[PDB]
């Protein structure tokens, strides 16, 4: 459906820019991987190594190991190989893949029964293929997990390869999460030195989170927006549970799609002309549908006479007034983001961060409830009225070097309010100036331009997506809520009441008989209990003769 053409559009635009920005956040770190590796190649029996710290995300970075295979085959410098630790229980498979992989690193770019490989032919490839290069290749042996390396295996290779060295100035990259102490644990001290490491850093999930939100979901490019509740539940699944931008992305598709099956009313979700084409295509059923929802009904409530029926009956004055609702709508959202970034360099500099720190936070709290109505905001007020002076004039002049950088580059508007602010702050650079700019940030921005989700234009539905609960059923995977509350709240209901009641351990003499004091009548409790085994609310337990006892709390 049109929304799926829009899906793949947005979708692969998203993972596209994600993988590219992955490649740039790389590029400083990878230009520093080949700049480090070319610093040690710039300047016996010791393996130098490269230690990269990738916090606790697995599959997203396999891309960039494919791209180290590639990129470090590209400089004309090394021929690179990657040894996985789980591939690698014994001492044989590493030297086998060692060499399989540097005879192979010579292959893939040209465009047996693999048992045949052993510890010789690497020592031959940078001898036989090239003994005289003359400039030796690194083979950065990407040990993608060195943490899971078998320690016996680990020292046997760092000692075998170390002993053999400088015929093979191996460097080896470390896929890792934690800090240096843990390497110094699994890799012994003799190894900590043989490795000659220079510690390196790689960016984790949470940064890619806050980045991607600031960029992607909060782009003005794509109209789609999220309600407080699936934003809260999502960023809760990300922050409180699983840190993968993988699960947040797949969850963001599932949000994208999930909404995009809500109702056709989003076909108007597109650029004003892309949407207005759809306006033309609109038919009388949809005319019924816009006649229905609130923020339209609300937009209908502050209305008038006939006019109102040429909304309700004669569709033309509506579809005109749809181009009135929607044009405005996609005007408002721009007027927000322009202004949201604005807020950030103001308050992202600020301490206490009571309202928020990261851009995603302000988006969150701003949209959750009235910033004005919240007192932590007023606290931030008191702060700005306190700081004053040059901290503020520097940070604010950076709000215009940088936010006039946004409206110079990041954002086109051109809204004419922005410009007025801009002139105001130029004039300052040359207190109640800070409080009329903040009051401008208050009445002219927070009051006006930053405003809420539900206080917004008509039709804030379908661009902003409600219905959090079902996704949490379809993602968060909360079976024991529905179970607990179901079995609690009826012969299996009463059965779980007994399985709550009796004591701790319940003897089947006086459990079959206590369930006969308390309660065809038996078979349903043995099926309740055999399920409660299969379910798992009990177990068929031997702690006492003929007993059923729960592992679950």
């Amino acid at each position: 459906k049109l929304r799926f053409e829009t899906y793949q559009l947005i979708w692969q635009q998203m993972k596209s820019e994600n993988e590219r920005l992955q490649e740039e956040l790389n590029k400083n770190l990878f230009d520093n991987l080949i700049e480090f590796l070319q610093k040690s190649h710039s300047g016996l029996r010791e393996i130098p190594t490269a230690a990269l710290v990738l916090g606790v995300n697995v599959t997203d970075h396999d891309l960039t190991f494919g791209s180290l295979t590639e990129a470090l085959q590209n400089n004309v410098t090394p021929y690179v190989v990657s040894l996985q630790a789980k591939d690698c229980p014994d001492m044989k498979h590493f030297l086998q893949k060692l060499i399989s992989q540097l005879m192979d690193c010579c292959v893939d770019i040209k465009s047996y029964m693999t048992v045949t490989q052993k510890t010789d032919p690497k020592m031959l490839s940078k001898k036989r293929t090239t003994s005289s290069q003359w400039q030796s290749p690194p083979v950065v042996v990407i040990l993608k997990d060195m943490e899971s390396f078998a320690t016996k295996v680990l020292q046997d290779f760092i000692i075998i390869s170390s002993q053999h060295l400088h015929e093979f100035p191996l460097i080896l990259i470390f896929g890792i999460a934690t800090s240096p102490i843990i390497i110094h644990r699994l890799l012994p001290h003799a190894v900590s030195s043989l490795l000659c490491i220079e510690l390196f850093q790689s960016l984790s999930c949470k940064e890619h989170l806050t980045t991607v939100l600031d960029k992607l979901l909060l782009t003005t490019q794509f109209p789609f927006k999220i309600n407080e509740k699936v934003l809260q539940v999502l960023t809760n699944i990300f922050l409180y549970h699983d840190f993968s931008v993988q699960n947040f992305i797949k969850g963001l598709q599932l949000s994208l799609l999930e909404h995009f099956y809500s109702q056709p009313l989003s076909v108007l979700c597109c650029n004003l002309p892309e949407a207005k084409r759809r306006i033309n295509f609109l038919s009388n059923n949809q005319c019924e549908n816009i006649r229905r929802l609130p923020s339209f009904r609300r937009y209908v409530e502050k209305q008038a006479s006939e006019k109102q029926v040429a909304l309700l009956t004669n569709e033309r004055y509506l579809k005109e007034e749809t181009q009135l609702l929607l044009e405005n709508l996609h005007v408002y959202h721009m007027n927000y983001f322009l202004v949201l970034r604005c807020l950030h360099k103001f308050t992202s500099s600020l301490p206490k961060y009571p309202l928020g720190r990261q851009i995603r936070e302000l988006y969150c709290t701003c949209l959750e409830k009235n910033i004005w109505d919240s007192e932590e905001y007023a606290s931030v007020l008191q702060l700005l009225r306190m700081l004053a002076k040059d901290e503020l004039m520097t940070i604010l002049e950076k709000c215009f070097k940088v936010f006039k950088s946004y409206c110079e580059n990041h954002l086109g508007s051109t809204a004419k309010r922005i410009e007025e602010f801009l002139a105001q702050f130029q004039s300052l650079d040359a207190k109640f100036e800070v409080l009329r700019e903040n009051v401008v940030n208050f009445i002219d921005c927070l009051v006006r331009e930053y405003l809420l989700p539900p206080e917004t234009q008509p039709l804030h539905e379908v661009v902003y997506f409600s219905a959090a609960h079902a996704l949490r059923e379809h993602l968060n995977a909360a079976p024991r809520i529905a179970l607990h509350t179901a079995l609690n709240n009826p012969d299996i209901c009463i059965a779980y009441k007994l399985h709550l009641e009796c004591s701790r351990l319940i003897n089947l003499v006086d459990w079959s008989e206590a369930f006969a004091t308390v309660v065809i009548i038996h078979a349903r409790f043995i099926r309740a209990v055999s399920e409660l085994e299969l379910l798992g609310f009990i177990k068929p337990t031997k702690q006492k003769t003929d007993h059923v006892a729960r592992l679950t709390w």
Partner: protein, 183 residues
């Protein structure tokens, strides 16, 4: 006697939707109180229907992950009995599937909890298969520790769409196999 049918009907409206989810690479999941047999077999009579629907009941002790991959590969897939090493098996079935495209195979497992499926190898298989896009997975779970055995790598390999699916029906053919001591 009256109520259950309506619910087993309501879930049917998600059905086509699940089909689309099945296209998108995810795999639906039913956490019920009861049995989805009439609903999963109505998913066989209503949605799946068609062809290439593999059925292995996990409360059946009879079928086995090796004979699961045979039962998929022997009759329905028709290619062969799956070769000794299951990784090689899937390499042949896949070099058939990676080569032969656009073949969608819908598999419905009652009670993944098993055995035989307890093996981390068994769910490295189901992990790869249900990770392999051609086929798709609808599992019905009971054991409270069912989410226990699914790790990060597997709940990634299984992209699980979890559904209310609160089901009131027995647990008759699921209940026929379990034996207790009063008899």
């Amino acid at each position: 006697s009256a109520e259950l049918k309506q619910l087993n009907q309501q879930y049917e409206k998600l059905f086509h939707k699940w089909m689309l989810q099945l296209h998108l690479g995810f795999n639906i999941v039913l956490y019920g109180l009861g049995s989805k047999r009439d609903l999963l077999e109505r998913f066989r009579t209503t949605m799946l229907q068609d062809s290439i629907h593999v059925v292995i009941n996990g409360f059946f002790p009879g079928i086995s992950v090796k004979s699961v991959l045979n039962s998929i590969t022997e009759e329905v897939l028709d290619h062969m009995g799956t070769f000794r090493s299951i990784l090689d098996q899937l390499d042949w079935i896949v070099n058939k599937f990676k080569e032969d495209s656009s073949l969608e195979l819908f598999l419905l497992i009652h009670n993944l909890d098993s055995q035989m499926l307890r093996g981390e190898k068994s769910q490295q298989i189901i992990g790869q298969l249900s990770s392999l896009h051609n086929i798709y997975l609808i599992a019905s779970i009971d054991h409270l520790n069912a989410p226990l055995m699914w790790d990060h790598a597997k709940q990634s390999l299984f992209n699980w769409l979890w559904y209310e699916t609160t089901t009131y029906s027995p647990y008759t053919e699921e209940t026929s196999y379990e034996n207790s001591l009063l008899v």
